[PDB]
Amino acid sequence: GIDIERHHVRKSQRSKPASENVYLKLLVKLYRFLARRTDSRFNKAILKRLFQSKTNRPPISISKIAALTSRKSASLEGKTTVIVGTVTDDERLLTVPKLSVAALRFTKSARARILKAGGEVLTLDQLALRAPTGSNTVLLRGKKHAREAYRHFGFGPHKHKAPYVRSEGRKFERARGRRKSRAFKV
Amino acid sequence: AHVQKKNPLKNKAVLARLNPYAKAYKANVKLNTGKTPKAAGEKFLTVLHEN
Amino acid sequence: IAKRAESYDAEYRKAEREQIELGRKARAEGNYYVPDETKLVFVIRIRGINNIPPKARKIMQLLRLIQINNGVFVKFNKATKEMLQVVEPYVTYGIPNLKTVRELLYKRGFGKVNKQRIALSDNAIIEAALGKYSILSIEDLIHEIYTVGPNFKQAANFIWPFQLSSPLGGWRDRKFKHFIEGGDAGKRDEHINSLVRKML
RNA sequence: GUACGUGAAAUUGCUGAAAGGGAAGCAUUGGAAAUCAGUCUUACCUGGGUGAGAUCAGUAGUGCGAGACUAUGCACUCUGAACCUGUGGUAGGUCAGCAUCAGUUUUCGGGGGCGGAAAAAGAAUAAGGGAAGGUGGCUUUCGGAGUGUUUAUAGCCCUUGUUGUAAUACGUCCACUGGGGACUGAGGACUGCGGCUUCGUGCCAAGGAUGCUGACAUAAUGGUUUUCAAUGGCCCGUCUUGAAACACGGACCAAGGAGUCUAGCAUCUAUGCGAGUGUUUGGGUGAUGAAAACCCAUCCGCGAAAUGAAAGUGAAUGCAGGUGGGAACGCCCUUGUGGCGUGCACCAUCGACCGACCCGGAAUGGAAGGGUUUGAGU
RNA sequence: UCUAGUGGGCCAUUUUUGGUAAGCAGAACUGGCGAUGCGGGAUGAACCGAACGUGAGGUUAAGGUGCCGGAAUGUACGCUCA
RNA sequence: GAGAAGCUCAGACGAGUAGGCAGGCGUGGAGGUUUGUGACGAAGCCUUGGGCGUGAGCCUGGGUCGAACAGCCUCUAGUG
RNA sequence: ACUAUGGUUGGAGACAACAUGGGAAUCCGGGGUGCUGUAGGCU
Ligand SMILES: [Mg+2]
Ligand SMILES: [Mg+2]
Ligand SMILES: [Mg+2]
Ligand SMILES: [Mg+2]
Ligand SMILES: [Mg+2]
Ligand SMILES: [Mg+2]
Ligand SMILES: [Mg+2]
Ligand SMILES: [Mg+2]
Ligand SMILES: [Mg+2]
Ligand SMILES: [Mg+2]
Ligand SMILES: [Mg+2]
Ligand SMILES: [Mg+2]
Ligand SMILES: [Mg+2]
Ligand SMILES: [Mg+2]
Ligand SMILES: [Mg+2]
Ligand SMILES: [Mg+2]
Ligand SMILES: [Mg+2]
Ligand SMILES: [Mg+2]
């Protein structure tokens, strides 16, 4: 006998994508090699995010990219933005600046507006050629907790989360237990 | 590398790989070459034999 | 490495002679020479993994004594002593001599290399792990453990807990009473060396 | 052969085999008997014997430099290419035996160093002390029992000297040494660490077994079946704290026999598109052949805004804010778990903004000013 | 983050209360069984030892060594006749 | 090269009811594929023969038999 | 005294001893019988 207590025994991470997309497999093949034959944390970051599910790879819009790369103390002037995910458009940004973006996917509107403003769109394999270790790159992520489910997670007394309701209005969970005039509030 | 552990206490070649000093190590040095006095003492022996 | 080993040998022999000379001088004068208390203790787990209360079970985990007949070197201080008191029924320990230390490391010495149990079959394995502490060879490591050098913690922890065999010749009739009571548990002073010979 | 395709199992007869002292069945291990497989030494390479043959390496010529190929000839034979033979070599299974090693281990020795009251004793020897007498002697009596003195014709105890570095035992250590037995041989060109060297792609016991022999080859070793012996093995399923239960179901065999489909909801994943998304309510190519594929308009659903019971009102002071941690990147050190600068995601936090509510508050409107608050907001 | 089973327990050591007592009822602590085979206690859910992949060799625990039965009709000193 | 879903080196570990997850085995039918098997014997069945797998199972010799049937990638369910 | 831990310890039990640790109360005896900050007065 041996007295071993085993808590973090099996690693909890993905070692490969769940996707069967053959081209994603080709990108993983490229970045398995790059993350192994370089000392770059950027390449290990790309390889890890290439495995992640859709909900763990939220989109980012060109407005957020334009805002994140144009801060007052930025120096992120002429550097390529990289996201392992989809780049969407923000139609509210009437005038798009000149941007260099590397992404898994571009929305048709996002791609057209980036190019029309004189910028450039790259796939991740084109990025690997240009910056094989991700030097002078802005690695970005979308907002993970913006999806609907995070309005509800952790619902409970005084947690101020959203209930699961079929309809919204009075008569739909706004009565006893939700106000002082009806027994108690939450 | 290292398919089979070899006990240095039995395999002399392995004991030479570790511990380069083993070749020059001299055990069983004689230090009783002198007159060998006796150190017991009068007080010690009278305490020893009490009761 | 050979020169360091030779100086360690001279150091061990010199310390031993001085102990004999001091004892002889005290006997001659009729006074008493109280030798230096041990700084090093070897601890062997004698109980299996059944029926262990929570405090003792935690202490043996902290001692890296997870399996019966496993063994570790521990630096002896007040904090270690009170831990060994709680686990007196479940372990035995005592003062190891030089033969015990060197033979444990030569025959059953394994190093924790990247959390793996690796046989100490070349001085390079020691230097890779403890070279920053000026420990380049198995004799360097032996000297650090035996004299409880300033990097004892890193050296002792680098050594995987020894996987001893059952003692050739068995134990005493009843293992699980105190050594003072004619059993095997608890502190047994220099008799830890005879036990290790049967188990190593 | 109509008692009819195939023709299972339960169950039965005959024949054969085998076993059997108040169950049987099973497991492990071997014996016995029965039965099964090795087809080896084939391929490829070289040598030997003879044999015949359009004959092979360099070349000549027919896409400029170098390399491969086919094709016309020459090279006309110690070369090269197909075929014949030998019980040709390396022989190839199965099993043994020994040796030299390696790994693990068990058992028996020998030598040495050191330690202790630098053992304690002891022996032989010189100087002491003492009491129990062998009683040397004394004496009941020439046949033995009792005294009463410290070496006599004996002996013992306790102290000190050397010949002492006494031995011996025990303890401890030797990178000292000599044998006996057993189990294992994972790996498969090389590379390492050591050692030795005549210093060299050398030798070794140094990152895991080789070498040398022999016997068998309707044998042996393996496999299977049956049975025997030795050892172990209670009747499954179930409810249960607990079942071998004197708890319930189960005589036997075949075939059938129990988490499905639908309207939703929730998390997670994949795919498409993305501030949008959803062609199948419909309409069209359509008639040919069309329940499919494919195409096409307006609506509508969900999402892009919340809040309030409601009337209503409705989201930027600022880089769409500040603070802390922080991915990734860049720069400085100087080899540290570094310092410096931006700071994604996310979490905690201080504000701002919208709605409700509570305020003062200068006919209808609620603008500026506020608030410990409040909302599934920005 | 989503979801299952579960919401009859039982045994021992030690601390206890109720009870005449109980193979009784109720609580405290830890170890267990339930869900745990294996060596031992002839037998046995909980006691001792020890917790288990398929195997070779070695050595042990608890417990044994007259025979059943692997292992001294071993050694030392006593006690005991029922 | 070594199905990169590949190859290679190393260390530790292994009880399990209720329960959870994964990877597999087997059955009917659907699309695709395999100059797939078959009256010179498909399927089925018997077996005192052989082989493979930890296992679910699979392959094969001999016997019987007479008209259909299988492998691989997917689809599917009144699937053990 | 009590107590954590230990034994296939003793004892029919009640309890007890032992082992590795922790460790009182009470009585009795000796000693003692206010110290000190801020601000200001005082032969
Ligand atoms: Mg033995
Ligand atoms: Mg014993
Ligand atoms: Mg039985
Ligand atoms: Mg139950
Ligand atoms: Mg039952
Ligand atoms: Mg019942
Ligand atoms: Mg019933
Ligand atoms: Mg019945
Ligand atoms: Mg059926
Ligand atoms: Mg016997
Ligand atoms: Mg398991
Ligand atoms: Mg069907
Ligand atoms: Mg057929
Ligand atoms: Mg049959
Ligand atoms: Mg098999
Ligand atoms: Mg069914
Ligand atoms: Mg006690
Ligand atoms: Mg116990």
From Swiss-Prot, chain A:
<feature type="modified residue" description="Phosphoserine">
    <location>
        <position position="135"/>
    </location>
</feature>
<keyword id="KW-0963">Cytoplasm</keyword>
<dbReference type="InterPro" id="IPR000039">
    <property type="entry name" value="Ribosomal_eL18"/>
</dbReference>
<dbReference type="Pfam" id="PF17135">
    <property type="entry name" value="Ribosomal_L18"/>
</dbReference>
<keyword id="KW-0687">Ribonucleoprotein</keyword>
<comment type="similarity">
    <text>Belongs to the eukaryotic ribosomal protein eL18 family.</text>
</comment>
<protein>
    <recommendedName>
        <fullName>Large ribosomal subunit protein eL18B</fullName>
    </recommendedName>
</protein>
<comment type="function">
    <text>Component of the ribosome, a large ribonucleoprotein complex responsible for the synthesis of proteins in the cell. The small ribosomal subunit (SSU) binds messenger RNAs (mRNAs) and translates the encoded message by selecting cognate aminoacyl-transfer RNA (tRNA) molecules. The large subunit (LSU) contains the ribosomal catalytic site termed the peptidyl transferase center (PTC), which catalyzes the formation of peptide bonds, thereby polymerizing the amino acids delivered by tRNAs into a polypeptide chain.</text>
</comment>
<dbReference type="GO" id="GO:0005829">
    <property type="term" value="C:cytosol"/>
</dbReference>
<dbReference type="InterPro" id="IPR036227">
    <property type="entry name" value="Ribosomal_uL15/eL18_sf"/>
</dbReference>
<dbReference type="GO" id="GO:0030684">
    <property type="term" value="C:preribosome"/>
</dbReference>
<comment type="subunit">
    <text>Component of the large ribosomal subunit (LSU). Mature yeast ribosomes consist of a small (40S) and a large (60S) subunit. The 40S small subunit contains 1 molecule of ribosomal RNA (18S rRNA) and at least 33 different proteins. The large 60S subunit contains 3 rRNA molecules (25S, 5.8S and 5S rRNA) and at least 46 different proteins. eL18 interacts with NAP1.</text>
</comment>
<dbReference type="InterPro" id="IPR021131">
    <property type="entry name" value="Ribosomal_uL15/eL18"/>
</dbReference>
<dbReference type="GO" id="GO:0022625">
    <property type="term" value="C:cytosolic large ribosomal subunit"/>
</dbReference>
<dbReference type="GO" id="GO:0002181">
    <property type="term" value="P:cytoplasmic translation"/>
</dbReference>
Curated annotation (Swiss-Prot), chain B:
<comment type="function">
    <text>Component of the ribosome, a large ribonucleoprotein complex responsible for the synthesis of proteins in the cell. The small ribosomal subunit (SSU) binds messenger RNAs (mRNAs) and translates the encoded message by selecting cognate aminoacyl-transfer RNA (tRNA) molecules. The large subunit (LSU) contains the ribosomal catalytic site termed the peptidyl transferase center (PTC), which catalyzes the formation of peptide bonds, thereby polymerizing the amino acids delivered by tRNAs into a polypeptide chain.</text>
</comment>
<comment type="subunit">
    <text>Component of the large ribosomal subunit (LSU). Mature yeast ribosomes consist of a small (40S) and a large (60S) subunit. The 40S small subunit contains 1 molecule of ribosomal RNA (18S rRNA) and at least 33 different proteins. The large 60S subunit contains 3 rRNA molecules (25S, 5.8S and 5S rRNA) and at least 46 different proteins. uL4 is associated with the polypeptide exit tunnel. uL4 interacts with its chaperone ACL4 and the nuclear import receptor KAP104.</text>
</comment>
<protein>
    <recommendedName>
        <fullName>Large ribosomal subunit protein uL4A</fullName>
    </recommendedName>
</protein>
<feature type="region of interest" description="C-terminal-extended nuclear localization signal">
    <location>
        <begin position="1"/>
        <end position="51"/>
    </location>
</feature>
<comment type="similarity">
    <text>Belongs to the universal ribosomal protein uL4 family.</text>
</comment>
Curated annotation (Swiss-Prot), chain C:
<dbReference type="GO" id="GO:0005634">
    <property type="term" value="C:nucleus"/>
</dbReference>
<keyword id="KW-0689">Ribosomal protein</keyword>
<feature type="modified residue" description="Phosphoserine">
    <location>
        <position position="7"/>
    </location>
</feature>
<keyword id="KW-0963">Cytoplasm</keyword>
<keyword id="KW-0597">Phosphoprotein</keyword>
<dbReference type="GO" id="GO:0000463">
    <property type="term" value="P:maturation of LSU-rRNA from tricistronic rRNA transcript (SSU-rRNA, 5.8S rRNA, LSU-rRNA)"/>
</dbReference>
<dbReference type="GO" id="GO:0030684">
    <property type="term" value="C:preribosome"/>
</dbReference>
<dbReference type="GO" id="GO:0003723">
    <property type="term" value="F:RNA binding"/>
</dbReference>
<comment type="similarity">
    <text>Belongs to the universal ribosomal protein uL30 family.</text>
</comment>
<comment type="subunit">
    <text>Component of the small ribosomal subunit (SSU). Mature yeast ribosomes consist of a small (40S) and a large (60S) subunit. The 40S small subunit contains 1 molecule of ribosomal RNA (18S rRNA) and at least 33 different proteins. The large 60S subunit contains 3 rRNA molecules (25S, 5.8S and 5S rRNA) and at least 46 different proteins.</text>
</comment>
<dbReference type="GO" id="GO:0005730">
    <property type="term" value="C:nucleolus"/>
</dbReference>
<dbReference type="GO" id="GO:0008033">
    <property type="term" value="P:tRNA processing"/>
</dbReference>
<protein>
    <recommendedName>
        <fullName>Large ribosomal subunit protein uL30C</fullName>
    </recommendedName>
</protein>
<keyword id="KW-0687">Ribonucleoprotein</keyword>
<dbReference type="GO" id="GO:0003735">
    <property type="term" value="F:structural constituent of ribosome"/>
</dbReference>
